[PDB]
Amino acid sequence: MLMPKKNRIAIYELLFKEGVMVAKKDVHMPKHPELADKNVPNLHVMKAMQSLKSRGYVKEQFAWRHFYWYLTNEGIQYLRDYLHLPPEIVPATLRRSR
Amino acid sequence: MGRVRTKTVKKAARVIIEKYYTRLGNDFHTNKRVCEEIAIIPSKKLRNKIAGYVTHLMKRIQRGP
Amino acid sequence: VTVKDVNQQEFVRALAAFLKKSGKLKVPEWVDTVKLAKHKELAPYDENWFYTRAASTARHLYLRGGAGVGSMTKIYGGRQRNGVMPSHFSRGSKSVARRVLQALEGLKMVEKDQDWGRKLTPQGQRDLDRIAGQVAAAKKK
Amino acid sequence: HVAQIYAIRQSISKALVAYYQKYVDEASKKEIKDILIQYDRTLLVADPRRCESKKFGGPGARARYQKSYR
Amino acid sequence: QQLYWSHPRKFGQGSRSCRVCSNRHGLIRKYGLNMCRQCFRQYAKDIGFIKLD
Amino acid sequence: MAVQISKKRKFVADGIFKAELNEFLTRELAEDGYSGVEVRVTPTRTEIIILATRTQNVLGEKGRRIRELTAVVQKRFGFPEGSVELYAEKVATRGLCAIAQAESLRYKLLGGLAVRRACYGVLRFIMESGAKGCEVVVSGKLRGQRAKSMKFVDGLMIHSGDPVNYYVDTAVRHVLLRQGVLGIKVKIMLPWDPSGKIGPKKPLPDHVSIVEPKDEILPTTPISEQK
Amino acid sequence: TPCGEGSKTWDRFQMRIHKRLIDLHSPSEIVKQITSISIEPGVEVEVTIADA
RNA sequence: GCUCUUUCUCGAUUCCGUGGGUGGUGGUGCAUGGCCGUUCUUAGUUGGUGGAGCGAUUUGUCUGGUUAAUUCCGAUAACGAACGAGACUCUGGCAUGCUAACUAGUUACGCGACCCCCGAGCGGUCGGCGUCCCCCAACUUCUUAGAGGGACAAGUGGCGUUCAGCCACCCGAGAUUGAGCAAUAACAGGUCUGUGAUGCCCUUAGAUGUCCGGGGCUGCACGCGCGCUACACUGACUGGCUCAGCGUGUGCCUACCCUACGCCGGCAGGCGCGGGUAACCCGUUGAACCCCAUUCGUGAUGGGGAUCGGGGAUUGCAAUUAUUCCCCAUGAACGAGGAAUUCCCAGUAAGUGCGGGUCAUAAGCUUGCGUUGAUUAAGUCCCUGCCCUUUGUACACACCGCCCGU
Ligand SMILES: [Zn+2]
């Protein structure tokens, strides 16, 4: 439900591991997609993320009982300092033609 | 046993006999093959309904223009 | 002659004479009180029906072999009149059907062939065609 | 059961109709065919009529469930 | 916590819902579609279904 | 998918994924000239083509919007990393895809001009593009506080039978005006008799063509000549 | 009718499917050549080696 | 560990008032979108230029014959065009012709074998196989589905202004299978209870949000509308007998599929188990009424199978207000149904059975399939209604109209 801090950082790493993070709307499945090994019950991605979206650092979408949350480019600087990771500009963008 | 062939068939057939009147004859089977060669008829059915009017129309023209 | 040239409805009666003449296959302790299916409302009027039932299922093995309990229960079926609701199909009894097949085993009539389907022994066929030589010899349509 | 009978009474006939052509004279067809056709057409010609589809509304093809009037 | 989800729903009409509108009435389940009636009608074209007959 | 699912389910699951993808895609490419996508199982690969005209969004700075949207699919539809990549294409003729017109009509309605000046412009463009016909229907609270309808027509407009399966293109989009929701229906008759950009079953059932005879051009009096 | 009202009117959707099966008797790399250039339409190709 | 009570931690992601309500099967389908139904299953509908009327409007859209059809030929102050019809798609027919088939037929054969004197036959050849084969057999009639092909008032004769066409007949699928598709203008026709499609209002912590528990949506003096069962002897009980076609069926964002075969159990069921992601095993789908025998004997009889008691199993977190299914047993209402009224004209009515759908438990319902197979029509506006034209009107939310006097 609420108040993990050692178990809220878990999603943040995925959110910057790739500039997107898909989800679902069902709240009862602890089988969270994309390596949920840190005991995330599919919440905290539709509880804390509505905070992240409402600030302007990530962007939201809905498609058939789903969410397609996008990390904005200018949210990288915000989510580089709270994560206090090295100064880097590569969430998922090699910035070359693939 | 037969229907009114609508303005599609009547107009299509009248041009054929007006453009290839010499290559046509009395018998339907002869006319069916001729029509396909000289016209791009989209449907098999209507080709046999256009060829139907053409042979009926030739029976008309031999009996007073 | 062969089974495929004689009247079947009287043929099963003919073999119902033979298993009365052998009279040693078995007769189950429950022949009095069973129903022969789950849909009937009254047990057969003839009490000696085991000679009849075993005449049929053994006979059907001669024409569509490889049949187990199911292919013998499927043939034994009819309307299952639930009364107010519409009727249906309901298969015949299971246990009553197999006890025939086991009883034929003791008489060595039928056997479990390859594919685990009851078939008929080459001595078993001799009995079925032999009685055919009698009904055929005494009846011309 | 009846369907099979109306098949065998045709197949057997069309067997002999087809047989007599391939190894016997064509007249042997006509002395038989005409006696066959002048008795029953179906023994030479198959029954084309076959069951047609069912429409929603009506247990059959063209019956209907009744209509309720206030 | 313990009473938030106490319902053993590996069956019943609460288990299956339309995979589009989160609703639970009038469902297609023929081929795993799980969709309701309407969301199938609105999408029959693109799946490959034809109003042909 | 671990026992090689039956053919019926697997083919209908092809459509659903091709259905999920499209409804999601139009929610992002709405401000762009999205038209509709196609996916094929290329040898040991997978490629999804975004048929669009306002491509400058999808091209991405050195290919980043492609990088942004490929990932959001792999994380969702279970695709393994290393075989799914999206390629973009340009629909060189855009005056004949109904979706492009429909959104551009939703585009111009929300932009803040009257419906009557906006629709005829789309109605003109779909004629300056060239089509055997076209039709736009705008329904809702166009004026006042009551629902009316409005209909634009020209050109041939078939309405029944098989040909509508491949000539006529229709599309619906809900516009969110300040007073509620309104709808747009756009229909376009496609002309190509030869193989155009989007090949139809080109001929038309009512069109019966005739060609030049080229006979009796000579009396053909008796002449003999040995080739 | 979606959920509200109407004379009892029913769609009858369809969805057809077909199949063709072939055997080839040669080294199997030659087949992979011919079948590589043909994936262009929406057609399924599953090629076995065990007579399944 | 809701609280009372307090002991443990994530520790500044919690916690309190102001601001914004995300949320909602809450109200308004008389604010809407979209989707359907209906007007209307008939044949109807517009505009460009032209003529008429000052004008609303009109002509084109018709005097006539003709057809399922404003479908034609015609007639013509109108000409040239678009929609609907038709044209198109699917489906059924039949093609002894075509490319093909161990996941189909093969089946005709070789009789390569195996078996019963199993019979005319001393016996072989014959008839049969419940069978057994590898492809180094023969193919494709049936099985499947691709291209084909085929029918078009064509051949002939009548009737017709002798144009459109109709009637009859050898030929044969004689133009004729059934549908899908569907215009103009609308309805304050249904749906905000399908939707992250949505305006406004209601409400948001003592929640109209959600989750959980037990109940209720099914309760009985009543009247209603779709339906299964019969009232019986052409029938019911019992035995034998033999035939079908659409589909359907297992790990999916998710919890369980179809079922042979051997044993236990009367049965309902159970236990090992061996196939199937399927022309492969279910399933050569060896279904029913119907076909042949016994019993019942006009009698509420065994027809009828309601109600009630006792028992025996199944799916499930939970069967009690009985989930289903089995067994014994009670054996009622009903003697072919008033006034009314619906559905139908060919493999249709009508009978019987089987799939799909809902479905953990499952159909008296509905969506489809096949089997058995008529009588009565080839017509008319008499009733309820529809399309076009001529006339009438004090009607225009349009006869469900308007309107008169004590
Ligand atoms: Zn839905």
Side-chain angles (χ1 to χ4, degrees):
Chain A
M1 182 74 184
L2 80 166
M3 295 298 102
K5 185 66 69 175
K6 59 172 71 175
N7 302 132
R8 190 172 304 281
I9 193 71
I11 301 299
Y12 278 108
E13 303 150 38
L14 289 171
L15 173 55
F16 204 81
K17 196 178 71 69
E18 282 155 71
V20 301
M21 42 157 279
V22 298
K24 198 176 285 307
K25 190 167 167 289
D26 264 338
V27 288
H28 319 82
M29 281 175 128
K31 185 192 82 67
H32 189 282
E34 293 292 328
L35 316 180
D37 291 330
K38 324 298 183 299
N39 285 333
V40 179
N42 209 343
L43 273 296
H44 319 105
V45 306
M46 62 195 98
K47 174 185 179 297
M49 185 63 72
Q50 73 177 3
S51 86
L52 278 70
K53 164 61 190 190
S54 66
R55 253 175 280 177
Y57 309 130
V58 304
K59 192 174 69 174
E60 65 187 1
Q61 184 180 184
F62 199 95
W64 291 1
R65 219 173 57 166
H66 289 174
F67 299 93
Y68 284 120
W69 280 307
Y70 292 169
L71 163 61
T72 68
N73 297 115
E74 66 154 50
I76 297 171
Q77 194 75 241
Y78 172 85
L79 294 174
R80 187 148 281 293
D81 287 326
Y82 166 64
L83 313 185
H84 57 278
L85 272 170
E88 212 184 13
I89 193 66
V90 64
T93 70
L94 313 164
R95 293 180 181 177
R96 298 181 310 188
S97 300
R98 41 188 304 126
Chain B
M1 61 80 71
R3 294 179 293 173
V4 193
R5 318 175 197 71
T6 64
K7 86 168 70 56
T8 300
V9 180
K10 284 189 170 59
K11 280 187 55 175
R14 278 212 297 259
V15 183
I16 301 306
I17 191 169
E18 182 166 320
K19 290 294 302 303
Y20 293 99
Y21 175 65
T22 58
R23 284 156 85 152
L24 302 153
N26 204 354
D27 291 331
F28 162 79
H29 292 119
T30 288
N31 297 295
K32 165 185 57 177
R33 302 254 167 255
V34 169
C35 295
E36 202 295 339
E37 208 275 345
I38 58 101
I40 297 179
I41 301 302
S43 58
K44 189 163 196 162
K45 171 175 165 299
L46 211 63
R47 182 151 50 56
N48 297 295
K49 276 185 72 178
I50 297 173
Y53 200 72
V54 174
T55 182
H56 175 57
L57 183 62
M58 301 266 258
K59 265 196 259 169
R60 184 52 51 51
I61 190 179
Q62 284 224 330
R63 285 223 296 102
Chain C
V1 308
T2 302
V3 174
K4 186 179 288 293
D5 309 63
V6 299
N7 301 265
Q8 303 300 319
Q9 74 273 59
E10 161 56 1
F11 203 90
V12 298
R13 179 161 309 155
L15 193 152
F18 184 110
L19 295 175
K20 194 198 83 161
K21 200 70 56 165
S22 305
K24 55 193 177 302
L25 290 72
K26 180 261 291 181
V27 295
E29 189 179 32
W30 60 87
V31 293
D32 295 357
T33 61
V34 296
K35 186 183 286 186
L36 191 149
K38 70 165 214 153
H39 49 53
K40 312 171 61 52
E41 62 157 351
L42 184 64
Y45 291 159
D46 185 76
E47 181 72 350
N48 290 318
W49 60 258
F50 204 100
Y51 315 97
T52 300
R53 179 160 158 106
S56 82
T57 76
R59 192 191 71 85
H60 286 164
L61 277 174
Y62 189 75
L63 277 296
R64 49 190 194 121
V69 186
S71 281
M72 299 317 198
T73 57
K74 292 179 48 136
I75 192 42
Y76 284 0
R79 292 172 177 191
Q80 193 251 356
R81 188 147 60 193
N82 196 23
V84 163
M85 283 172 239
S87 296
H88 298 95
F89 181 33
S90 287
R91 293 180 181 177
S93 62
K94 288 186 73 172
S95 190
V96 176
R98 60 156 67 105
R99 298 312 306 236
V100 169
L101 277 297
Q102 304 214 40
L104 301 203
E105 290 184 353
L107 186 144
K108 93 172 299 295
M109 182 36 48
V110 309
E111 41 175 59
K112 226 145 322 212
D113 233 296
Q114 100 294 6
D115 312 327
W116 323 155
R118 314 310 246 89
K119 300 215 164 99
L120 183 62
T121 73
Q123 310 164 1
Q125 303 224 340
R126 179 261 197 294
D127 287 325
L128 268 297
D129 313 298
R130 165 170 45 84
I131 190 168
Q134 273 203 100
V135 173
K139 177 54 167 56
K140 188 180 197 306
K141 192 71 169 67
Chain D
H1 285 158
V2 162
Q4 308 200 24
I5 297 176
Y6 276 77
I8 62 186
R9 65 179 293 204
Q10 184 178 182
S11 86
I12 297 172
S13 179
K14 197 146 53 175
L16 186 149
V17 175
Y19 185 84
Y20 263 120
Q21 189 275 331
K22 271 300 188 319
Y23 304 74
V24 190
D25 62 282
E26 273 272 317
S28 292
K29 277 198 140 159
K30 75 171 295 305
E31 301 146 80
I32 297 177
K33 190 175 283 183
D34 269 313
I35 297 192
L36 275 181
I37 190 181
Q38 296 294 321
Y39 191 91
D40 177 63
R41 177 174 153 72
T42 307
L43 301 191
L44 295 173
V45 185
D47 284 300
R49 52 187 159 291
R50 300 187 59 247
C51 278
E52 66 183 1
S53 175
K54 158 187 166 302
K55 277 77 173 172
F56 64 81
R62 301 210 217 151
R64 273 312 170 287
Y65 316 109
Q66 283 154 220
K67 274 171 50 173
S68 65
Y69 281 178
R70 190 181 77 181
Chain E
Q1 177 165 11
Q2 305 170 0
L3 318 179
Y4 167 80
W5 205 250
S6 163
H7 209 257
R9 279 185 176 179
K10 54 192 201 313
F11 63 87
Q13 199 172 2
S15 179
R16 293 160 269 90
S17 187
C18 186
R19 64 192 281 161
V20 168
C21 54
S22 296
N23 204 350
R24 255 182 308 256
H25 306 165
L27 313 190
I28 300 299
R29 324 151 60 191
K30 193 177 195 294
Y31 299 144
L33 301 185
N34 300 309
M35 294 182 286
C36 65
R37 157 186 64 238
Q38 300 85 3
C39 292
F40 164 72
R41 214 201 90 81
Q42 186 186 6
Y43 274 91
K45 255 202 167 180
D46 308 333
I47 297 169
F49 288 113
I50 308 167
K51 191 199 300 292
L52 193 147
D53 199 16
Chain F
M1 296 214 84
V3 71
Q4 310 313 72
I5 301 310
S6 59
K7 297 323 175 173
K8 285 163 312 213
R9 306 173 42 77
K10 182 171 71 69
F11 296 176
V12 180
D14 283 2
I16 301 295
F17 155 63
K18 290 153 61 180
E20 180 51 289
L21 172 57
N22 189 359
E23 170 73 25
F24 150 69
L25 268 185
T26 187
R27 291 202 177 193
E28 282 173 356
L29 295 174
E31 62 96 12
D32 291 331
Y34 181 39
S35 296
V37 298
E38 68 96 23
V39 65
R40 65 179 64 88
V41 60
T42 43
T44 73
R45 276 180 178 178
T46 306
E47 65 183 1
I48 297 87
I49 297 189
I50 301 287
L51 297 172
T53 64
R54 279 263 276 289
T55 60
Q56 70 276 17
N57 286 87
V58 303
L59 287 167
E61 303 92 307
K62 290 188 179 63
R64 195 200 49 71
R65 293 294 298 163
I66 297 178
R67 192 163 33 258
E68 202 285 347
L69 272 173
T70 61
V72 74
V73 160
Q74 323 184 10
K75 296 181 63 178
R76 155 71 172 78
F77 298 97
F79 285 92
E81 294 179 353
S83 287
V84 163
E85 267 196 345
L86 264 66
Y87 303 94
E89 293 284 9
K90 278 172 295 311
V91 185
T93 182
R94 78 163 163 275
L96 295 165
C97 195
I99 297 97
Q101 324 284 331
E103 270 315 319
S104 53
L105 189 53
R106 182 257 288 281
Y107 190 88
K108 168 53 201 303
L109 266 294
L110 281 181
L113 207 54
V115 310
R116 214 159 279 149
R117 204 270 179 169
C119 275
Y120 283 112
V122 176
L123 183 63
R124 287 334 289 189
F125 180 31
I126 193 79
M127 291 335 307
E128 289 149 19
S129 63
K132 290 179 166 263
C134 78
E135 154 177 355
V136 180
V137 172
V138 187
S139 309
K141 270 189 277 193
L142 290 203
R143 328 180 303 253
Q145 195 143 281
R146 274 295 315 279
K148 291 330 191 303
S149 46
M150 172 185 202
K151 199 171 191 66
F152 302 70
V153 307
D154 71 1
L156 282 75
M157 191 55 38
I158 193 60
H159 269 164
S160 81
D162 181 73
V164 310
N165 290 275
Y166 63 91
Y167 288 169
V168 180
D169 191 331
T170 62
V172 192
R173 291 297 182 282
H174 312 282
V175 307
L176 277 296
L177 265 290
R178 60 181 296 101
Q179 279 317 317
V181 62
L182 286 57
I184 301 297
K185 306 181 182 57
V186 288
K187 305 187 184 184
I188 297 98
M189 281 265 288
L190 278 297
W192 310 278
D193 200 7
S195 59
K197 207 65 166 66
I198 297 181
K201 190 167 174 296
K202 302 97 185 183
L204 177 75
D206 265 327
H207 172 55
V208 166
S209 62
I210 192 40
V211 299
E212 297 176 349
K214 278 199 161 49
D215 291 331
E216 266 178 43
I217 62 184
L218 293 174
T220 312
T221 50
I223 62 174
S224 297
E225 59 88 19
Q226 294 212 359
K227 278 278 175 295
Chain G
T1 285
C3 71
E5 150 75 6
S7 198
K8 280 70 200 166
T9 314
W10 291 63
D11 280 327
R12 284 161 310 240
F13 299 99
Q14 293 194 110
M15 199 199 102
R16 313 222 205 198
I17 190 213
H18 307 251
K19 194 202 291 173
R20 277 85 166 94
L21 295 174
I22 62 190
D23 285 333
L24 277 296
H25 289 86
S26 292
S28 292
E29 190 277 331
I30 301 291
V31 179
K32 292 187 285 294
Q33 291 154 358
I34 298 154
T35 54
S36 69
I37 62 174
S38 299
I39 58 96
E40 307 178 14
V43 176
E44 329 296 328
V45 176
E46 309 99 13
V47 180
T48 74
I49 191 173
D51 268 341

